[PDB]
Write a protein that binds this ligand. Sequence first.
Ligand code: HEM
Ligand code: HEM
Ligand SMILES: CC(=O)n1ccnc1
Ligand SMILES: CC(=O)n1ccnc1
Lengths: 182, 182
Amino acid sequence: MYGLVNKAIQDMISKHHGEDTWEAIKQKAGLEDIDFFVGMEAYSDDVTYHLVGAASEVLGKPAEELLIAFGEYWVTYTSEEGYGELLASAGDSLPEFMENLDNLHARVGLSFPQLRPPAFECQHTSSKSMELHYQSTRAGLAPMVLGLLHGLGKRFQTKVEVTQTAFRETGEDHDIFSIKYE
Amino acid sequence: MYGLVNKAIQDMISKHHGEDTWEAIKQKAGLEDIDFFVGMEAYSDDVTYHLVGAASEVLGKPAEELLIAFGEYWVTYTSEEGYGELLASAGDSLPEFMENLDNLHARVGLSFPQLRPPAFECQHTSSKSMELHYQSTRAGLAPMVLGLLHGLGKRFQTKVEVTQTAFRETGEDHDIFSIKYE
Ligand code: HEM
Ligand code: HEM
Ligand SMILES: CC(=O)n1ccnc1
Ligand SMILES: CC(=O)n1ccnc1
């Protein structure tokens, strides 16, 4: 993924547990080479999965727990490290924001030309709920989606309950989530 | 399962979509025979699975969506139809409550002598998270667990993020969930 994603993971861990723990985690991941991540440069996905795996071992937490945290962090981190206006342009409510999400990533992708963004389709089951279809070229990041949805809830002061109802992981064509809000 | 469970399903559907729908649903499940469920009597599990499938066809919603709703409802329905004090005895926080859950179901089963309750084990990964191990003699109810957990979040005013990381369905030994709270 682009290095911004890894820089975020680093930031989150550095801020929550310290530079020593980040160093250990980098080292365990077999990335001591890399002095720093370049935000606008493409890295092999490997780098991200390894960091997450290594972060799991060192912190003694499951990978999935970290991806949930990281999902929520990213909402804050993007608003502060140069994507605040772009974020705000995507709307001022959760369902609006999610409807716009492919369009946000399209805009991101003019600037990051090699982006393989996820794809998100909403079916609104009412004014307070929806089905969210998450399609990705990558495996394993549904728990990140969950955290991202909870970060979006914080951003719009909406309470969101999210439950995953289909799993790419088992062989289903793609992750699907039921979501209830305010 | 005991009829209480089926009575709760009936109630949730009558209250949400009307008696006419309930009838259809009951009709579709091939249970027109049964005039009312007896709360303290044992039914074949068959009855609950048919009602759920039938509810899915009549309503145009996936089974899994209904089980999530039903899980959340049950938390409210038990507190109002005779299990309020027992619920409250199980604690005033989500992680406490989950640690007490086998004990709760044990008390329930002195009163319901043929109870096949689930089993839940918590490994706390921090003061705000845990791995929850759901063991059951039955298949299919993981989405019900998700709703129940959201229902418990409501009861304790805690925001809970839940993601399932192992699936009995696929032949893994049992369902496992990563959970983050408030
Ligand atoms: C300003 C806001 C955002 C920016 C700059 C951003 C940028 C990115 C970038 C650069 C990637 C890497 C894709 C790649 O390298 O191939 C990505 C992936 C991702 N984005 Fe965003 N994004 C933003 C907001 C969001 C939000 C709010 C969500 C919420 C659901 C979201 C969900 C994801 C997901 C799930 C991926 C995972 C990759 C995959 O599934 O294939 N993004 N995004
Ligand atoms: C407070 C009152 C509660 C009562 C009275 C109650 C009673 C029951 C009863 C009677 C069953 C049917 C089992 C059978 O017929 O053999 C059952 C199943 C179940 N209970 Fe509860 N329970 C309560 C709360 C909860 C809560 C909060 C949860 C949250 C996790 C929970 C999780 C379940 C699950 C998952 C089942 C499904 C059966 C299975 O996995 O085998 N229960 N409970
Ligand atoms: C990979 C990452 O932190 N994200 C999450 C959403 N968009 C990019
Ligand atoms: C069958 C069912 O939803 N439950 C859940 C908790 N206790 C009973």
